[PDB]
Structure formats: structure tokens, C-alpha cells
RNA sequence: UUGACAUUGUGAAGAGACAUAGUUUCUUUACUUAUUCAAUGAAGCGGAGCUGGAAUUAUUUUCCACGUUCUAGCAUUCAAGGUCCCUCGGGGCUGAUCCGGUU
RNA sequence: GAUGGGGAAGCUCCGUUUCAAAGGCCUAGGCCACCAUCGAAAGGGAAUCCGGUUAAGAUUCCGGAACCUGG
């Protein structure tokens, strides 16, 4: 018995994917990890003003890692807090990253660390 | 040539972003075809490239909670919120859309199906309508005067709407210059001016 | 076997039994798609003798072109 | 109870919305289920040579039962039975006596369409079922004639599939007898006079008399309106 | 544009010929399944009685089925009721006559 | 402008709901409706303003004060 006469395909059962051989055989490393997505720091005089007067790092970031990434190897790496992050595609084909740091951490201080000033 | 160009439609093409939409009578279903079904004229708005203007009437599905609205093609003398009736007993009132075969000869309708389906192919420019002349029991077919003057004969199940097209006497005013024919042109379709 | 009468039946095209069986199937085949896949070969014994075989790997398919 | 109150409906044909129905008779089918009706209603419309529609006159319930029943004593040895037969061969005609004589005869049903026909006109054959329902019709209709000539008695039973299921097989086409038992011999002997009565001595005038027509519900009413 | 050839099938009746057995060839008129056109989220198609009536012949002729016309709103929850079963509530009939290629 | 289909020897043409079995919601059981997609930095749109800052950036950066969305 029927109350339509509109007739449709019965929603039939579906059967889940079992291949019998992986797909690839090896699952692929991490594309962009934390040192991956920070290729280089940025020394330029601007750069080196807004560390003490802005308290915001300059950092050379590759074109695939986006903020989320970026705030995530920052913290990572140097176990520092984040307060924002902002991001630009330099005219030379690179992707320069301004990280802000929070009042409890310096950048002086981790510009020091790291090894540049 | 022009005439030869006009086959490949492509600036011919019909403005019809303007156009209210397609004019067509109630479909004929059960509810019609054997009762009648009551319909409130909402609005009448005038239609673009179109000189009779149209009225929006709203009827509910039979078969569903819900309204369904038509666009009938206004015939003189309605009214905003009249209702209308569209069936094999409606009655011979203007406004209502009845079988060729129910009304009696001699009456005016517009917009009188050619088949029985069609939802209104004849008497749909304004001012015009047909007139019923005869009828014929026998293989039941409707003797009727199209607005041409030529004399048709169609089945009676054919539906009409009593009376004449609205927005008789448009053409009886001099247009007094190409502006207006231009304007009128603009909505209708690209075929003006008319070159030699 | 069933071959000679078969293949002797399917030469009398003209004959009532075959002219309407050929009737019927060209209104069966009108109806489906213009290139479609017949679950079984019409003609056992022509299939045999174009080299088919009854069994896997083998694909009979109907199809009509315009005249 | 005075809380609950009638709420007659009045649906009519100009008022209140209708309720559910049923409409299987209106319903949109898949294009091949309309294509499988039209061709079945095409099938019975159109006057059908003689040869056609000598099918479609089927073995009676009881007789087909009968014969069918009686099939079933001779079905043909089974995958398990044949290695258990197999087995036995390779353990007593090897290590006993009696090459390929330590099985006793073999009686079973004869079901190839090819193995059936080279059994006639031999001929052999002692009963013949023909299937009414194989789509590539050609390739049954010279049975009832072949077997006619042959005075091999033959029955045009209802289902190709049930015999395939009487000889462990999808579908069969065919089904017939060789040997059998002698203590069946009076059964045999009761089916084939029955089954000769039913088709072989009827299939002589019934090769006249064109099929097929007979006319729809709608135009069946119609007609019968007119002659009123 | 036009004559022929295949799609072109199936009934009834009228006329020339087979052989005073009975089969064919033409003509006239009919049916559809071939084929074509149009519509529909394929919903009321055909028939029959109708619980009906209006309406008259001799037996049941004919009409519809018999839920809508002072008004610019409303009509939706397996529909309420009755009915019989298993109670907070769930299930069959009716409400909504039966049978049979969407029109 | 594909898909379902219909043409074309063929590169490919027609067509966007048309003669498709065309998919999406409640707790194993029920219920609901006809179509892909692209197409505007001048059409519609969900939200920010003030002061200052570079040799070159801001309604984006800083100091201040709000708004829109999802949980």
C-alpha cells in the first residue's frame, strides 16, 4: 500500500570500504610541523624597532602554514604565549608572520634567546 | 537578411525579465472537472510587453494544507477580492471559469481553451473574446467566433472565463511620436524600428 | 540437438511466428535506451557460431542506429 | 464522555483538504516495470501465430503435481553424492574387482535442452516437459511438434524455474525421462496417457485457431456498452 | 510538392475469382497495441450496483450520486466519533461502497 | 553549464527538470519533497570609531572605547 504516486529509490544498505591493501602502504609525516611552518627570523631595522617598542616578533613563515599553525610552533617552540598573530605575503613571494607576545613575556628577551638582536 | 536573422533568436530573444510571469488557467483536476473550487482575486497587476492587465488569484490545494496561487488574465469589470469560481458548476458570472459545453450559446468568454488542458490559448489579448453560436450534443463540441472572425469548432470540455479582456481601446490613441513606440518596444522584443 | 531447427527457424523471417516475435521485440528494444546491455544473447545458436561461450568474461549488448 | 465531542468531516469536492488514499492504480512506476506490463499486455493483444499461445495451455495443478512427484524419485546425483560416489569408485574398483561395475545402473531425469532433443528422434524418450516460460521462445517451440512427429509423449508445464529446482539447477528448460523403475512402470504408464489425452491428441486441431485476442478491461466495457 | 516501397496490425458488411464443398482478391465501415501530440510533484480513469433520491413503466426508461454561491478570515498533526481487541496508550473495520492499461 | 537522455563515422551537437528508481529528517521503527554548479571587488550583505605612530602601513600597528557570528 502506497499513499504517493511519486516513486523513489529504497534507501538500501551501503556497505562500509574494506580494501584488502592500504592505500599507500606508509602514512605520510607531518607536511608543515612546528619546524616547518618558521623557516627564518626577520632582522630588518623596522623589524628590530617593533621588537622593544611593540613587543612583536618578525618571523619568516612558509606559504602553506596559516595563523592557527603559526600561533601553535610559536608556542611550541619557544613555550611562549601569543597574543595575536598576524600575517602578509611579502612582493618578493614570502610570507612574513608579526606575532605579538603577551605582557609576560618579552621579546628582547627571547630575541636574546634565540640568538639574534 | 533580417527576416531570415530573426530564426537564430539571438538579440530577438523576448525581454521577460519584467514579465509577471506566465498567464495560464486553473489546471484542470478532479475538483474542477467533476465540482468547482472558490478563489480570491488578491491583486491585479499589469504585465510588461502585455496590454490586458493580470489578476492574481489564489486558490487552496485540494490535496494539501496549502494555497496555490494562478495568474488569470484579467477580464473587465473584477474586482480585488471578488471570488472566483472555476469548475463545471460554477455559475455564469464574469470572472468565473466555466466549460464551454455548461454555458449556454450566445455567451462571451476570453480566454477559452483550445483542447481541454491547455489552460486558456484563445481571446487573451484585450478587449477580445469569443462568442459561443452553437452547440452540438452530438460528439459534444462547441461552436465558437474567434476574435479574427473566423467561425472554430472545439470541444465542449474547453474552459473560458466569462466575459471580454481588460484594457479595451488601447490602440485607439495615436502613439504621437517614436518615444512611446520605443518604449513600448524596450519590453516586447528587438524588433523595432523596421528598417525598409 | 536444437541447432538445425533454430538455425532453419531463424531464416524463415517471413513466417507469422517469426514476424511477430520480430514485431514484439523491436517494440520491447524501441523502448529501452539506444545502447543497452542484454542479459542473455536472443540467438543461442548465432552467438555459438560467432565464436560465444557460456561463461564468465563473455557480454552480449544491444544496441540501434538510425537508417 | 461530555469532554469528547463529535467532529464530523465534510470533504466534498470545494472544501476541506482530502485525507490519505491509496493510489497504486495512479502511482509513477520505474520505466522498466511500465515497459514489462506494456510488453506483457502487448503480448496477449496482438494475435499470436499458432505455434505461440500452444504454450500458456498448462499441465492441471494435480497432474503437474502428479508428474512432479513423481520426478523427484530420478533427481540426478548430487555434488555430495557424487564424491561419495567418487570415493567409493577409487576405494573398490582400484583395490576390489569389477571395473566401473562396483556402482549399480543409474536412473536420473534427462534435463538438457541439447541432451533432451538428441535423446528424441533416437528415439529414447519415454516423457517430455517443456517450460512455458522461456524467454528465448524459439528455442522451445519446435518441441511439441518434434515430440508430435516423434509420437514422444511431451507437457508444457508451468515454471521453468521449478524444474531447475527439481534437477538442482537455477532454471531448466526442459526435463524428461529414459529409464525408470519398474515398480513406477504403472505411474509412468498413468502420466503419459493423462499427459497424451491433455496435449499429444489435442495438438492436432488446436493448431488452428489463432490467439491473443482478447481486449482490455476499458475496452472490453466499451464494446460491450456499445452492443448494449 | 507529389506516386511507390517497409512502420501497415485486427474485426464487421458489399462486390470480382479460387475450388453446385469453401478459400482468396478489391471496396465501405469499425477496434487498438504500432506510431504521433499534450498534461500531470502521473489523484478520482472505466464498469457495477448505489444506504440515495428526482423521476415512469410493467422491467426497471432517464438525471446526477444528493456535503461549497450575500462578505477579503479559518480549514494542516496515521481526522473526531462509533465499533472489536490488547492501558500511560497501541492496533483492525467504518468514517471515505466494490472490481478492474496516470489522463 | 555537466549529470539522466536524444543525434553525430567522428573531433563533438541539443538540452537544465525533460519520457531518471535523481534525497533528507526524527528513536532497530516512522516521517518529509524535484534538484548539480559557475556567474557582480559599482546589485543584496552580519559586525568599528577617535588620537598618534614609519624614509615608505593602517578604519589593519599602538592607547582608548563597541559591535556581529558559533559553542
Known amino acids: ?117 | 537578411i533580417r527576416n531570415q536573422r530573426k530564426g537564430a533568436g539571438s538579440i530577438f530573444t523576448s525581454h521577460t525579465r519584467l514579465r509577471q510571469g506566465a498567464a495560464k488557467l486553473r489546471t484542470l483536476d478532479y475538483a474542477e472537472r467533476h465540482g468547482y473550487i472558490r478563489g480570491i482575486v488578491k491583486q491585479i497587476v499589469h504585465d510588461s510587453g502585455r496590454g490586458a492587465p493580470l489578476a492574481k488569484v489564489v486558490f487552496r490545494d485540494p490535496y494539501k494544507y496549502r494555497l496555490r496561487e494562478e495568474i488569470f488574465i484579467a477580464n473587465e469589470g473584477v474586482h480585488t477580492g471578488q471570488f472566483i469560481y472555476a469548475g463545471k458548476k460554477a455559475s455564469l458570472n464574469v470572472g468565473n471559469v466555466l466549460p464551454l459545453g455548461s454555458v449556454p450559446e450566445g455567451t462571451i468568454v476570453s480566454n477559452v481553451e483550445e483542447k481541454p488542458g491547455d489552460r486558456g490559448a484563445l481571446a487573451r489579448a484585450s478587449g477580445n473574446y469569443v462568442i459561443i453560436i452553437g452547440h452540438n450534443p452530438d460528439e459534444n463540441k462547441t461552436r465558437v467566433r474567434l476574435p479574427s472572425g473566423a467561425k472554430k469548432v472545439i470541444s465542449s470540455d474547453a474552459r473560458g472565463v466569462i466575459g471580454v479582456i481588460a484594457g479595451g481601446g488601447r490602440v485607439d490613441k495615436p502613439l504621437l511620436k517614436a518615444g512611446r513606440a520605443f518604449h513600448k518596444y524596450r519590453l516586447k522584443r528587438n524588433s523595432w524600428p523596421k528598417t525598409r | 540437438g536444437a541447432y538445425k531447427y533454430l538455425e532453419e527457424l531463424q531464416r524463415k523471417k517471413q513466417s507469422d511466428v517469426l514476424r511477430f516475435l520480430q514485431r514484439v521485440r523491436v517494440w520491447e528494444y524501441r523502448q529501452k535506451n539506444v545502447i543497452h546491455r542484454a542479459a542473455r544473447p536472443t540467438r543461442p545458436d548465432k552467438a555459438r557460431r560467432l565464436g560465444y561461450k557460456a561463461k564468465q568474461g563473455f557480454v552480449i549488448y544491444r544496441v540501434r542506429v538510425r537508417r | 464522555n461530555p469532554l469528547t465531542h463529535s467532529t464530523p468531516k465534510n470533504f466534498g469536492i470545494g472544501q476541506a483538504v482530502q485525507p490519505k488514499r491509496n493510489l497504486s492504480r495512479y502511482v509513477k512506476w520505474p520505466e522498466y516495470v511500465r515497459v514489462q506490463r506494456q510488453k506483457k499486455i502487448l503480448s496477449i493483444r496482438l494475435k499470436v501465430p499458432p505455434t505461440i499461445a500452444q504454450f500458456q495451455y498448462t499441465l492441471d495443478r494435480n497432474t503437474a503435481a502428479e508428474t512432479f512427484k513423481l520426478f523427484n524419485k530420478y533427481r540426478p546425483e548430487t555434488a555430495a553424492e557424487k564424491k561419495e560416489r567418487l570415493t567409493k569408485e577409487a576405494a573398490a574398483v582400484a583395490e576390489g574387482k569389477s571395473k566401473q561395475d562396483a556402482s549399480p545402473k543409474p536412473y536420473a531425469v534427462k534435463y538438457g535442452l541439447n541432451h533432451v532433443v538428441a535423446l528424441i528422434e533416437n528415439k529414447k524418450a519415454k516423457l517430455v516437459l517443456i517450460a512455458n516460460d522461456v524467454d528465448p521462445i524459439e528455442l522451445v517451440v519446435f518441441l511439441p511438434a518434434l515430440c508430435k512427429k516423434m509420437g514422444v509423449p511431451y507437457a508444457i508445464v508451468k515454471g521453468k524455474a521449478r524444474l531447475g529446482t527439481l534437477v538442482n539447477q537455477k532454471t531448466s528448460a526442459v526435463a524428461a525421462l529414459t529409464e525408470v523403475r519398474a515398480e513406477d512402470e504403472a505411474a509412468l504408464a498413468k502420466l503419459v496417457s493423462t499427459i497424451d489425452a491433455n496435449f499429444a491428441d489435442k495438438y492436432d486441431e488446436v493448431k488452428k485457431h489463432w490467439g491473443g485476442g482478447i481486449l482490455g478491461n476499458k475496452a472490453q466495457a466499451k464494446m460491450d456498452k456499445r452492443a448494449k
Open chain 1, 1 to 117: 500500500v502506497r499513499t504517493s504516486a511519486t516513486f523513489r529509490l529504497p534507501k538500501t544498505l551501503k556497505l562500509a570500504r574494506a580494501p584488502k591493501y592500504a592505500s599507500k602502504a606508509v602514512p605520510h609525516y607531518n607536511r608543515l610541523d612546528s619546524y616547518k611552518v618558521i623557516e627564518q627570523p626577520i632582522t630588518s631595522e623596522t623589524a628590530m624597532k617593533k621588537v622593544e617598542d611593540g613587543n612583536i616578533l618578525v618571523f619568516q613563515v612558509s606559504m602553506k602554514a596559516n595563523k592557527y599553525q603559526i600561533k601553535k610552533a610559536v608556542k611550541e617552540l619557544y613555550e611562549v604565549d601569543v597574543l595575536k598573530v598576524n600575517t602578509l605575503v611579502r612582493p618578493n613571494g614570502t610570507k612574513k608572520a608579526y606575532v605579538r607576545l603577551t605582557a609576560d613575556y618579552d621579546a628582547l628577551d627571547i630575541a636574546n634567546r634565540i640568538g639574534y638582536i
